[PDB]
Design a protein around this nucleic acid. Structure first.
Ligand SMILES: [Mg+2]
Ligand SMILES: [Zn+2]
Lengths: 114, 192, 237, 396, 123, 148, 150
RNA sequence: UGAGAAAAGCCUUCUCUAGCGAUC
């Protein structure tokens, strides 16, 4: 039993011992946003999610800067944020579209209720 | 060499003594390294996978490890310097919690007199500020260790008793802080 | 746009061992960097909290396209010995070295002397890569340097691929081992149709005491390309 | 079926004897266990001779001979000694079999049951020769695999660019460390003699003077004259003495003085290693990329290689992308760094940067693939840059 | 010859190469210059690479063979940059040119025949 | 879904045809005295490569001395002999599996139940004997086929 | 398991019963010899093998040979050397051959085998031992000198 | 489905691989 318990704390040797992070309200908020990425952009379509639940083993990081992609692919440091949800809070394009869709549903629902 | 030797200072001294693998066989490392280990070090010299380095490459490596050993010599002198000033300014605190922990306690408050104004409960949880405010907002259980976790008395005790010892040490420690801050005589009689 | 530098991203394991998924606004295929802080061919890397992963480009590598295409087995796992035929500069070889890890070994064979110098420089940084600058058509000329292996990966792009693979499989491949062979239909026979070539190549494998098990195309990334996975001298069940 | 097999390995040559085997049904599911299982393999195969290689150079010579199919002197020494002289010898290469049969009367066979036995020997080789050699079989193959590859391509160990990337990273690291320690030194000595920070503008110069004068109480006569030599001008040294005589500083304890002197000494010793590393980088760049160093300078040229990640990667890039590698730090835009005769106007600053990038791309290609590197091409490219600079500045 | 210019075309193959280059230029299927030849290799739209062995530094085109080995793109050398200039339809010598992949092009049969001939030179 | 098929049209099937011959197709060709290679070329106006599997060859041998003539015709240097590793001798499942894998063959058979199985597989033509001539079923490029 | 050990004990029985014929050994001594021989035999026929078991087996047989040699002089019986002593020496040679096959790299075992061959074995058996030694240990010049010295 | 269902601690019976053993 104790040797089983130790083996479930890590992904295993096949993936070089990835650990399961402690779940928090900030980590859970990020994973919920990733699942609902289909509705962020009306002109972008995605495949179905691999699993309905959250993955047991995962890790969080940022993409390293490259000298070659100074103009092609690089975000200025003022626009960078600490977490995924704050990035969604910042950009105007996603906020502008989402508030129009949400208001339309409520305006439809208000007529539905009446 | 990196796998067999873990002491960083011992590693750099061996490099400073001998540059290349060829001179491992002739040279002697008895004063730096135990005789049983140096035989393993000497044996691995013949069976090596590394590439041969140029004369300029080995000279640059020698200059780097020379700088490494001098930092330890100065850091030891700086650590001995800290023990002397802690003994003169706050002798009673150093006897109780230690030189390093007492120095970190003073640095956190910014001064000895600022630390004296604090209560006994605050000194216990002085280091653990991130756990305190997280627990207070979420209405969870408060931390109990703080910077006192690295004290000598707290370290020796069993994990079940590390909670009781922390508050007993912290309550007694502030008594040494007040007397060292306000008393006009420097002695270790009370702290002992 | 794309995956710009400075974006938060999540990494989760793939179905295959040693391979990872880079989940975000886009999903990329990544492997754990054996030498952190270095890019082999300018790929984008992600820093994880001491741990670093490198993106895998399916257009410049045929193994990545097969994985993205939905292959069942690649048989390349950590702690395995892999014989690689046609290493070229080593773009795909670097990702293979990441999968096998420190315990596994990769044997890189490349006849070209120009591309051979790049492999040696890559072998400087990765202790698990053994460069072999020799012709793959004559396995007996380098039989001293290679022990028994588990997986043979071939990307030689020659009309006589099956003969080259069979000669290497008999000499170095262990019983129960597997092979992954990439077939460019235009190279073996330009006159015949692409799929008729694929049926002929499968037949020649059976005549060499090799049992092919699966095949698939690499259509989104390559045209008239196929990958065949099989087993050599299967053990009795 | 009694015969002898010759197995060649990176560690040495091995001679083995086969007692009995089921030849016809060997490639069948049940009989195949005879060679797969170690216990059954020991039953029918024995090790009669083993000759390890003395050194790596000896191993490399034998590896070349085996590949060419000729018989090395070491191989004949083993064969003549332990083979009776009507003998069946198994070899993996038909060419080496014919060569042995010419030199010695042994009959050589290259196929059949022998090919299957050799796979059994290859699978179980480490068990048969365990402990007979000091160097392990796994490392011997790794060691021989490299040295065989270098000989074929004529690899040159001097023209390896690894040290340049390591040096650039450390030079950036050393600069940050020196600046941080120098700030604390000035603050600590500011408690005793605050006037010195205003006169001296260099962190390295400040620490050198802090070593020279422990206390402002004793700086007079001959010590002033010696102080005048360390300072670039004698006028400031005389003003330093008046600053020492009339100062607002506080006297420091003896033990506080010993601590600051040992600390300020280390910053000086840290700085001189950084100067030595820069000299080491300059000499390394001359051997690896002389033409690139001639065109743009050793410091800028080494940084361009660091951004590319290798000298080969820099050459493979097109001319347009090479400019972008210097876009963040303005390596091409900021011209005094690289120094050129003449100046470029703000209107033509962009054009000169594009032209300079193309020349550096060509220079990197010359350095990368050369039989011998030579800096004559770099000087010619530099002269072309000056001609274009003079063309824009004067108009012709 | 410089030994680095290994796939050197003979007299007969040179005439076929230069004829195809001039035909490809009429169909807007040719990229001219060392820098432009590199870009097509990065984008994977190249049939084959033709280079001139008479460049006074041969070193400036030696990066192109390295890129060809990774993309499995055939390449050859010719003896004259001036002769290569005329077929490319330019008034200056050219040291490297690239034939571009075009869908539905009617030069496919001529291009395919040349690719087999180039591969034959490498034994 | 295979990339060869443009809906129900097989584009990679080319003028050199590789075709799988059934054991009963050989016997009925001899009864009508139709040369195997020659009659197939008349139907398609192209070069045709008849292919014989090990299972199909095995069934001919099991027929005995009465069917020796068909056995000698089956071993013909122009023919393409391809192996198959199946525990058994049943040939209909052997041919059907090869149809599913590669989609490049044309099935030549006269058995009714086998033909109804192949029709469920998309993009593969069926060849059969009608009257005293060869006929093709699901080929757009039939050309010189019997017209009815 | 015990079938091989049983074969070896039944092979050891005839020299023990001849020794009982001699009067050199008593019946209880024969019983004790059988018991200890079986105990030592069980150790070297296992699936997991150690060198010290082979060493103990060899040492026990050497001690038995020495005891027989001491007692024969006191009795004065010099007949039937071949029935007992040669059988024991052959068994010890078989044990040494198995041990040397299992552990080739151990020079000390080879030297002990050479010493026993010098003391108790025919000169041709010692000649075969040196050839086996020099075949796999030809990189040690000292072993060449020892063979030439003999 | 219907010795209902659910959870903990002890014995009994047995299944897979993987080394190891066969060199006298
Ligand atoms: Mg039927
Ligand atoms: Zn069949």
């Amino acid at each position: 039993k104790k040797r089983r318990k130790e083996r479930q704390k890590t992904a295993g040797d096949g993936w070089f011992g990835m650990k399961a992070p402690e779940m928090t309200n900030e980590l859970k908020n990020d994973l919920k946003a990733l699942k609902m990425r289909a509705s962020m952009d009306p002109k972008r379509f995605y495949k179905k999610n691999d699993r309905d639940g959250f993955p047991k083993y995962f890790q969080i990081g940022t993409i390293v800067d490259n000298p070659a992609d100074f103009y092609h692919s690089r975000i200025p440091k003022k626009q960078r944020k600490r977490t995924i949800v704050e990035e969604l809070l910042a950009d105007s394009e996603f906020r502008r579209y989402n508030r129009r869709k949400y208001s339309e549903i409520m305006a439809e629902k208000a007529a539905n209720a009446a | 060499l990196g796998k067999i030797i873990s002491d960083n200072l011992t590693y750099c001294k061996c490099l400073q003594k001998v540059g290349d693998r060829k001179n491992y066989a002739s040279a002697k490392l008895s004063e730096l390294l135990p005789e049983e280990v140096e035989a393993e070090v000497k044996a691995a010299a013949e069976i090596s996978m590394g590439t041969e380095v140029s004369e300029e490459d080995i000279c640059n490596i020698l200059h780097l490890c020379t700088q490494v050993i001098e930092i330890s010599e100065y850091r030891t002198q700086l650590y001995e310097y800290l023990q002397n000033r802690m003994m003169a300014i706050a002798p009673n605190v150093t006897v109780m919690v230690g030189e390093l922990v007492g120095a970190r306690l003073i640095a956190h408050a910014g001064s000895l007199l600022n630390l004296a104004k604090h209560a006994a409960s605050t000194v216990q949880i002085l280091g653990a500020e991130k756990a305190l405010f997280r627990a207070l907002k979420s209405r969870r259980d408060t931390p109990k260790y703080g910077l006192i976790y690295h004290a000598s008395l707290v370290g020796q005790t069993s994990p079940k008793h590390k909670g009781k010892i922390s508050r007993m040490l912290a309550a007694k420690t502030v008594l040494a802080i007040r007397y060292d801050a306000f008393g006009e005589d420097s002695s270790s009689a009370m702290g002992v | 746009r794309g995956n710009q530098s400075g974006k938060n991203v999540m990494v989760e394991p793939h179905r295959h061992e040693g391979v990872f998924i880079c989940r975000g606004k886009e999903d990329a295929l990544v492997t754990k960097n054996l030498v952190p802080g270095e890019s082999v061919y300018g790929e984008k890397r992600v820093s994880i909290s001491k741990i670093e992963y490198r993106a895998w480009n399916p257009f410049r590598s045929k193994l990545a396209a097969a994985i993205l295409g939905g292959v069942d087995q690649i048989h390349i796992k950590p702690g395995a010995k892999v014989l690689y035929l046609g290493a070229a500069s080593g773009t795909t070889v670097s990702h293979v070295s990441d999968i096998v890890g420190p315990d596994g070994l990769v044997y890189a064979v490349e006849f070209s002397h120009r591309s051979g110098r790049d492999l040696i420089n890559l072998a400087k940084k990765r202790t698990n890569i053994i460069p072999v600058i020799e012709d793959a058509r004559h396995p007996h000329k380098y039989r001293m340097l290679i022990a028994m292996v588990d997986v043979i990966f071939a990307d030689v792009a020659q009309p006589d691929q099956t003969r080259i693979v069979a000669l290497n499989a008999h000499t170095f491949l262990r019983n129960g081992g597997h092979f992954v062979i990439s077939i460019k239909a235009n190279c073996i026979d330009s006159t015949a149709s692409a799929e008729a070539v694929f049926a002929s190549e499968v037949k020649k494998m059976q005549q060499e005491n090799m049992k092919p098990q699966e095949q698939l195309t690499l259509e989104p990334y390559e045209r008239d390309h196929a990958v065949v996975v099989g087993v050599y001298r299967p053990p009795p069940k | 079926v009694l015969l002898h097999v010759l197995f060649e390995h990176a560690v040495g040559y091995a001679l083995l004897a086969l007692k009995e085997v089921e030849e016809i049904s060997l490639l069948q599911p049940q009989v195949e266990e005879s060679v797969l299982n170690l216990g059954k393999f020991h039953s029918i195969v024995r090790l009669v001779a083993f000759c390890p290689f003395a050194s790596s150079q000896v191993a490399l010579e034998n590896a070349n001979a085996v590949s060419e199919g000729v018989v090395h002197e070491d191989l004949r020494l083993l064969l003549e000694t332990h083979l009776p002289s009507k003998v069946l010898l198994g070899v993996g290469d038909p060419k080496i079999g014919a060569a042995i049969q010419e030199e010695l009367g042994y009959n050589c066979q290259t196929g059949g049951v022998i090919a299957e036995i050799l796979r059994g020997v290859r699978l179980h080789f480490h068990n048969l020769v365990k402990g007979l050699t000091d160097l392990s079989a796994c490392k011997a193959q790794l060691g021989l695999g490299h040295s065989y590859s270098r000989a074929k391509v004529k690899f040159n160990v001097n023209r390896v660019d690894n040290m340049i990337i390591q040096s650039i990273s450390l030079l950036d690291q050393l600069d940050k460390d020196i600046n941080t320690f120098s700030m604390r030194v000035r603050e600590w000595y500011g408690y005793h003699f605050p006037e010195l920070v205003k006169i001296i503008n260099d962190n390295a110069t400040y620490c050198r003077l802090a070593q020279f004068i422990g206390n402002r109480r004793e700086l007079n006569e001959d010590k002033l004259e010696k102080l005048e030599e360390l300072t670039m001008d004698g006028a400031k040294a005389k003003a330093i003495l008046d600053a020492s005589r009339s100062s607002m500083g506080m006297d420091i304890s003896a033990i506080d003085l010993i601590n600051i002197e040992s600390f300020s000494s280390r910053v000086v010793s840290l700085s001189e290693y950084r100067q030595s590393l820069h000299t080491y980088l300059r000499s390394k760049m001359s051997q690896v990329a002389p033409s690139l160093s001639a065109l743009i300078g050793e410091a800028v040229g080494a940084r361009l290689i660091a951004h590319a990640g290798s000298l080969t990667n820099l050459a493979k890039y097109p001319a347009s992308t090479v400019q972008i590698l210097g876009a963040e730090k303005a390596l091409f835009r900021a011209l005094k760094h690289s120094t050129f005769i003449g100046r470029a106007a703000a209107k033509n600053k962009g054009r000169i940067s594009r032209y300079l990038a193309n020349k550096c791309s060509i220079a990197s290609r010359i350095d990368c693939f050369s039989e011998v590197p030579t800096s004559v091409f770099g000087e010619k490219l530099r002269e072309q840059v000056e001609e274009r600079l003079s063309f824009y500045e004067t108009g012709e | 010859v410089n030994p680095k210019a290994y796939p050197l075309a003979d007299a007969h193959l040179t005439k076929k190469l230069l004829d195809l280059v001039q035909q490809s230029c009429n169909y807007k299927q040719l990229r001219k210059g060392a820098n432009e030849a590199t870009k097509t290799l990065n984008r994977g739209i190249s049939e084959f690479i033709v280079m001139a062995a008479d460049a006074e530094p041969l070193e400036i085109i030696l990066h192109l063979p390295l890129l060809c080995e990774d993309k499995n793109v055939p390449y050859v050398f010719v003896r004259s940059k001036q002769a290569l200039g005329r077929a490319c339809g330019v008034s200056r010598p050219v040291i490297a040119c690239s034939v571009t992949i075009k869908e539905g092009s009617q030069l496919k049969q001529q291009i395919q025949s040349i690719q087999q001939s180039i591969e034959r030179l490498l034994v | 879904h295979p990339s060869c098929l443009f809906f129900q049209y097989n584009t990679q099937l080319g003028p050199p045809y590789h075709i799988l011959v059934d054991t009963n197709f050989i016997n009925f060709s001899i009864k009508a005295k139709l040369d195997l290679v020659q009659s197939m070329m008349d139907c398609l106006y192209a070069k045709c490569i008849p292919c014989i599997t090990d299972c199909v060859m095995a069934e001919i041998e099991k027929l005995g001395q009465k069917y020796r003539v068909a056995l000698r015709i089956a071993k013909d240097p122009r023919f393409e002999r391809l192996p198959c590793t199946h525990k058994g001798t049943y040939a209909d499942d052997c041919l059907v599996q090869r149809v599913t894998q590669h989609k490049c063959y044309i099935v030549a058979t006269v058995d009714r139940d086998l033909k109804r199985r192949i029709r469920k597989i998309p993009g593969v033509p069926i060849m059969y004997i009608s009257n005293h001539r060869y006929n093709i079923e699901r080929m757009p490029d039939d050309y010189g086929a019997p017209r009815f | 398991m015990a079938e091989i050990i049983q074969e070896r004990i039944e092979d050891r029985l005839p020299e023990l019963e001849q020794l009982e014929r001699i009067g050199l050994f008593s019946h209880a001594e024969i019983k004790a010899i059988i018991k200890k021989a079986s105990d030592l035999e069980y150790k070297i026929q296992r699936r997991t093998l150690f060198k010290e078991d082979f060493i103990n087996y060899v040492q026990y047989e050497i001690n038995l040979l020495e005891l027989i040699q001491r007692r024969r002089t006191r009795i004065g019986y010099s007949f039937k050397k071949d029935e007992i002593e040669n059988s024991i020496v052959h068994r010890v040679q078989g044990v040494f051959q198995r041990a040397s096959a299992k552990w080739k790299d151990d020079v000390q075992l080879w030297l002990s085998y050479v010493a026993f061959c010098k003391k108790w074995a025919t000169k041709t058996r010692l000649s075969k031992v040196f050839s086996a030694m020099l075949a796999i240990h030809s990189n040690k010049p000292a072993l060449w000198i020892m063979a030439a010295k003999w």
